[PDB]
Amino acid sequence: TTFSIEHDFMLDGKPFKILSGAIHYFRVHPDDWYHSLYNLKALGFNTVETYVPWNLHEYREGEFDFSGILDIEHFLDVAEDLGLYAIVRPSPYICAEWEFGGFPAWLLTKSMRLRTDDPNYLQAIDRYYAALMPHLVNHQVTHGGNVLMMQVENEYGSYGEDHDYLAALAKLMKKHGVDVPLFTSDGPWPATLNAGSMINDGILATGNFGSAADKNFDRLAAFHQAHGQDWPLMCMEFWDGWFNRWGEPIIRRDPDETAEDLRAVIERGSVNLYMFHGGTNFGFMNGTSARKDHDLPQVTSYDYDAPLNEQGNPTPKYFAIQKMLHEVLPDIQQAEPLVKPTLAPAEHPLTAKVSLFAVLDQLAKPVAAAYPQTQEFLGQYTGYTLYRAQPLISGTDKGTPAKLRVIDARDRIQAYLDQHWLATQYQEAIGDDILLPQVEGHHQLDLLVENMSRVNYGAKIEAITQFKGIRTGVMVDLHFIKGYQQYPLDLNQAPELDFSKDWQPETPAFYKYTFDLTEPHDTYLDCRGFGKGVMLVNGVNVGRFWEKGPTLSLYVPAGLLHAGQNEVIVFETEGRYAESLKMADHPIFEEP
Amino acid sequence: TTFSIEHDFMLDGKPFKILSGAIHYFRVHPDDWYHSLYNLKALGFNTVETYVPWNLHEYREGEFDFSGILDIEHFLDVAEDLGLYAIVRPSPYICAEWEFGGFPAWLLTKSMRLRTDDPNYLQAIDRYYAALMPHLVNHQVTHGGNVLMMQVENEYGSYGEDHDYLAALAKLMKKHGVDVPLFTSDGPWPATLNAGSMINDGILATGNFGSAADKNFDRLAAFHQAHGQDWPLMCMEFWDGWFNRWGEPIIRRDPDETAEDLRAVIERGSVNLYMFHGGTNFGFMNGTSARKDHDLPQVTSYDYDAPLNEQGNPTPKYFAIQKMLHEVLPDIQQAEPLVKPTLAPAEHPLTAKVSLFAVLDQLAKPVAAAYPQTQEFLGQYTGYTLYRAQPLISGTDKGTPAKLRVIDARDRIQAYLDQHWLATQYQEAIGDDILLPQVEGHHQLDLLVENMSRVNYGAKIEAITQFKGIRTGVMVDLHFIKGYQQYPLDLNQAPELDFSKDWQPETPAFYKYTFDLTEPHDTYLDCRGFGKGVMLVNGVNVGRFWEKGPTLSLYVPAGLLHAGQNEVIVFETEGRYAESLKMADHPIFEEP
């Protein structure tokens, strides 16, 4: 296969229209890759597109992983065998409604200005690319594979205008053997395109939008023409749905209107559906939005109201788009989409339960320090961090109870004295006075701090709030306390816990539901009756839950289950839990 | 003279009651030191007390100054010659309602945790003490001088409980030859005393309070006794007035009640009046209070409703205290206090005026950078910093005006495009959208940023907001801009400015009032008719003004004036100025 960019995309010397769909391999169990890709082919599309998440492939510095759900080579193979081409977007920053926009948390511990011409930043990318690009180079069409082109950065005109950065990053990609055509994507209007594109370097600029295709392509064309380029018009992200956030209602886009809006793109050029199949933000990898200085975390589900639902099954939107495509491009071969079944509903009794405080040393090796550090400096890049102190409590000026204040912490703190709950503070409320029990002497202060994920877009990508944990300290009366034990909790140790140890009410705890399955199928965990936390299925954290809503369940793919004895462990922080774990055949929702 | 601490203070073998008054040499023109000290002796007091401000003595790292108003040796000499003893408090942190509580701003550029057992912190103190302590050592009573005692830290129980820090600091003081008795001062209640005192090291703990002397001395005594110490009770700060902040009304404490409250201290032990004579926060050296995350800057005047007013003249409170002391201790010799005159009122016409933008290169050598730094990294530790960029302005998504946002800046920003005012944002408002003119191409963006002073007490001493200037960047539309010229303005160059250059309305500008005086006297500059800024008298910045109030004038001592041709230069940022500078014989006030 040959691929180059002229007036049209030229594939094997012939004008080509790219019909792409976004599937993030890292958001879908590898057992279901074939399924989703097949359904992309069945729609009538010729290409699949995916980001590459730096913060999963190099979760810890120097510890690379390209196995299982991170095996991008196998992903691209399955696509090729189904006769799909591919677009890869291996930017250090991917946005993607994803923890820190894809940046590894350990970058925060370095002296480094992200998304700029910073030598330490570019070097770290160089070292990342040394591990990644061997898994991509030979998948290029130039090496007999199916990868047509690769993106430089991601919507950089929506963050900066450092052109030396873009040029340096492109050079890095080429140095690691990327010889396929390169491109940028941006909002299709002058300010973003001027700042974000590499048009003066002869590199194709594309546009991201979800409507008004004529308006947007007109501006994109105008930009091309102003730089004397004769290029194809491609919507590199056609937002055919939207993401959801905790406490905000679900956003639903009419299937047929979506098709109509997509029609106008296809008439005038190429397109990539964002998303085609969205899948799931497993573990702690959800992203976070920011309005001014206020953060708004995104939910576990990345359904995205996409053509395929979270599970991977076809929606009315899929069929409306399939119908529309056959009207506009009748020669494209189509097929019926595959549909996966769901487990029959069931309820499983509580097997055992144990409090966090009882099993602390199975979860983490404590780091002693005079004063506290954020989790990144403890070598923890996601999840929960417990800070323990033994503060002296003593009489106050006015005789009233001594005030506890947490100074400079994110995102959510729970405070305990002698393992009894005092207060819960979220974001801006952190720093408000917490009245201590009127007691005497030294007492055990516990602060469980949750990282609810780092902002993935906009001004706050490098905000001081991107550091998670306690940054400054904790005050009793008028003084900062000294002497902490810092527990970076690894909840992936949850299956090794000794549940025969004690449980206490109104306390973070683990709850085990052990149960037998005759045959594994896709299913939904009902999270109603639990307060807040995460759930692990056979040792794998499938994501967060919160009574706040609107999502009140967790998708669990069949691949995480097996015939025989299965195990779900719930980590729950509010003290609200269910006597039986219910599994349902549909996703549960509530109005927030 | 001999001095030691037993049940009483022992001076020359005999029980001694310390009657001290706080006079900050650095807040009073050296010509008026004799005056203020004389009035302290005339009150019937035997001792004077002063802080030592690290951030004036070592304003820039390695540049020590002990001359003029910073000549502590001459200060202590004048006191001795008047037959006063002295207490010096040479802590790195002095609080004192003073810029950064006395810490040099360049400490922020170092890797260092303030007021803790940090080796880099202690080292920097060691180096400071190498320069300072030679100016103190020989003034000790042990070397024939008049200094009785010296404080370790300042109200450390109102910040931390790191005892290794206190012990290390005491050791530093002794290493530099401090052999006089040491003490700590704190709020007189267990929590502060437990955290802050050095009682277990045999070092006297004292208490700070402004009322309820029996309640407070009872707690202080109880603390002493609990550690098996038999010690004198001393109020190391008797708050006999209070400080003021911009936008808050003046606080006035009844003269006679003050005397009564002070009586109860003197009956039971020793005392130091805070303040006896408060004087003036010259230049930019005012302090700042914090409530949670919200900063509240203190005013230029440090009148403090003290026995001596800002000028140094005796108030009803002085006389009430003098009377009270003669009742309780009739043998103490007293005298009539000295009273200084004031200039007769006058008005001086505007001589010349010039805009800041016209004289930028006389004020500062610009530092070029791709991205902005806070003033500390530019070598500027107080005052105003102008950031200049040349951002490309171009069409937006919706066609509406492009939004300007300042990301992470403190304390107050003024934005201009092509030297025309756009917006002014204070503290929390910084980051709100500023609508740019609907224009095209590159344009000059100017951001004048004011440091209104770093927090001097409490949780925020090491807050990220203690960095002044632009920390993160400036956004146009969705992108951070690249390319700044950074001007660290030195307003002390104001007399060298070429005023024949152009002036423009609604623009930061300098306004010169040149005028003749037959004989110099103390006076007040009337700041009504000016918006906000500072005033320099014969090249010396006498402090800030603001129409906000309640203080609407600036005290000017006679020592800053001379017979012949004098010069006042106003730097004013809002665009509101007076055609004539009025000088009044009393301080002007307005209701905020």
Side-chain angles (χ1 to χ4, degrees), chain A residues 113 157-162 164 189-191 194 219 371 394-397 428 430-432 457 477-480 482, chain B residues 113 116 157-162 164 189-191 219 292 371 394-397 457 459 477-482:
Chain A
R113 184 181 289 114
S158 304
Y159 189 77
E161 48 155 40
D162 195 346
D164 295 333
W189 65 83
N194 282 306
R219 286 192 298 204
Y371 297 100
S394 66
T396 67
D397 186 37
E428 287 82 0
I430 296 169
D432 290 344
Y457 176 96
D477 188 57
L478 294 188
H479 62 277
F480 284 110
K482 170 189 198 193
Chain B
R113 184 180 287 112
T116 69
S158 305
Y159 189 76
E161 51 165 52
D162 195 346
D164 297 327
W189 64 83
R219 286 192 298 204
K292 189 179 166 64
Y371 296 100
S394 66
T396 67
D397 185 40
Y457 176 96
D477 187 58
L478 295 188
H479 62 277
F480 284 109
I481 66 181
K482 170 191 162 178

Side-chain angles (χ1 to χ4, degrees), chain A residues 365-373 377-378 386-388 482-488:
Chain A
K365 291 287 169 295
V367 183
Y371 297 100
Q373 289 192 284
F377 295 97
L378 305 182
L386 178 65
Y387 299 81
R388 175 166 289 181
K482 170 189 198 193
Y484 291 80
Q485 298 170 107
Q486 302 172 109
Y487 292 82

